[model samples]
Target: TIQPGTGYNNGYFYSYWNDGHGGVTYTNGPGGQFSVNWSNSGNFVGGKGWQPGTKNKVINFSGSYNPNGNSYLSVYGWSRNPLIEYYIVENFGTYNPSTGATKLGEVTSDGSVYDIYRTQRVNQPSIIGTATFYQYWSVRRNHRSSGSVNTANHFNAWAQQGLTLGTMDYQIVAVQGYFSSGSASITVS
Candidate 1:
């Protein structure tokens, strides 16, 4: 989930997009970063609602999801300019890109496989600022070797696709993959 990281949530320094979502919990990442654990709770879907409000920056679990549209066992970051991005090596899921979504092939990292998807969304005008950027994702899609998952700077991958995510500093925004309501007990290195 890539954004300008402005206005609305202001760099994830606030709450998740789906303030209504809180079944997951967070802990230190694999190495002092972050992780997204799980639980059970409400999703952020109220009317036409704040679509972004439905979006989340988290991890994976057994059927846990927020509102906007994502899956369980995931990590997210909002940035016009990024803080840090995630690289997932999978054991589950598929590399099925959304309709019209760009499929940028596959990769093998840390002994895993991941499919990449890139989509451009319209910028929501509001208390934040004007925008121009698309969402870039490299998801895991082969759950045959499950031994936990991943995180890495995706600047190169995005760049390979011509997707510009402001500052590619690889700075992590404060999200835990498999992190949180019922907030699962996740620990990192």
Candidate 2:
């Protein structure tokens, strides 16, 4: 009983009704349903439907996916508020072929609490190895007499003390260790 009309810019089709109302009904695509209720008010009800198309944006990091020496690592605040005080530990050092030990730089988020770190790659000489990094922070309360010692209380205390509060101190650590040219052929005992 309903004849589908052309697509509209808003992704709907216009339908003509001649049963006294003589109005238009906006219906969704072939299998889609109308998201909004039918309207009778005088307005551009239908027409110019959004075309179904695939996103053309590229997602892979082609050129930006390089991890060479002297690559800087940084940490950013993902919370609404800033992190007051925090510390970080990294493994940045010399690359020894015998011991397979490498060094990496480290930094902590304090002051503005949105601190970042840039370090050089150390494990490039190793063919197959993994680098480990660690980061942790302690809660510092503003007022000494802040109420209960629950998570909320800790946050409140930090806030009152003008100290870092919330769960912003959680760190999302990432590491990129490299393998040397000949290290790939060498096996560990």
Candidate 3:
């Protein structure tokens, strides 16, 4: 029903979540590498999914991770009934800064500097005539920021923090995650 998996180099395109649940998604010549080994079977999740479109987008993930349990790294999103319409978490090593995360403050576009947060959850759809499953997160408190993502100033930094809902093919989605579980072999460039 939700069989997600993919990857492509140079121009950078990626996605993965097949049984190993993103634990061994790979690429050699110049970008992308993973190797996680932890589980909860309901399959929490993981990423590196790539490209949709709306403006200019650039995902730049760095490396030197050390999480052996829970994981973090985001800038994730999905759509069709508010299914995680906003995400920016980046807390490496078991993200838990007092439950439903909320620390919204600090941002510096396209070259580095960010520290924002907000969390919400619920999900069941991943295409296949999606129904609805809530997932609302807006976070970015250092999961390792390498060169700022070209999120086109997050369209006025998320509509000046009201988090726009005016509709978008104002599209912009790029992926870079290590998500959860054990052995995430980090070595991004």
**lDDT, candidates in the order shown:** 0.36, 0.22, 0.45
Model 1 spans > 4 angstroms off: 1-17, 21-40, 44-70, 81-100, 125-132, 144-153, 168-183
Tens-digit lDDT track for model 3 on 1-189?
223555454444445454454343333234554433443332444444355534346656655444544455555555443433555555456544325556555567654556545444344445334444433344444445343465556545655765443322212122233344443444333
For candidate 2, which ten residues in a row score worst on lDDT?
A: 180-189
Better of 2 and 3 by TM-score: 3
> How accurate locally is residue 176 in candidate 2, as Cα lDDT from 0 to 100?
17
> Which is the leading candidate under lDDT?
3
Q: Which candidate is the best by TM-score?
A: 1
| Model 2 misplaced stretches (Cα beyond 4 Å) | 1-68, 71-78, 83-87, 93-165, 176-189
Number of clashing residue pairs in every model? 41, 14, 13
lDDT of 2 by residue, 8-99 (tens): 32333222212233322333323222311222312211211112211121111001112222211111111213323221212211221113
lDDT of 1 at 166: 47
Clashes of 1: 41
Segments of candidate 3 deviating more than 4 angstroms:
1-10, 13-55, 58-68, 76-87, 90-94, 97-102, 105-137, 140-155, 158-189
Sequence-dependent TM-score of model 1: 0.47
Residue 136 in model 2: lDDT: 21
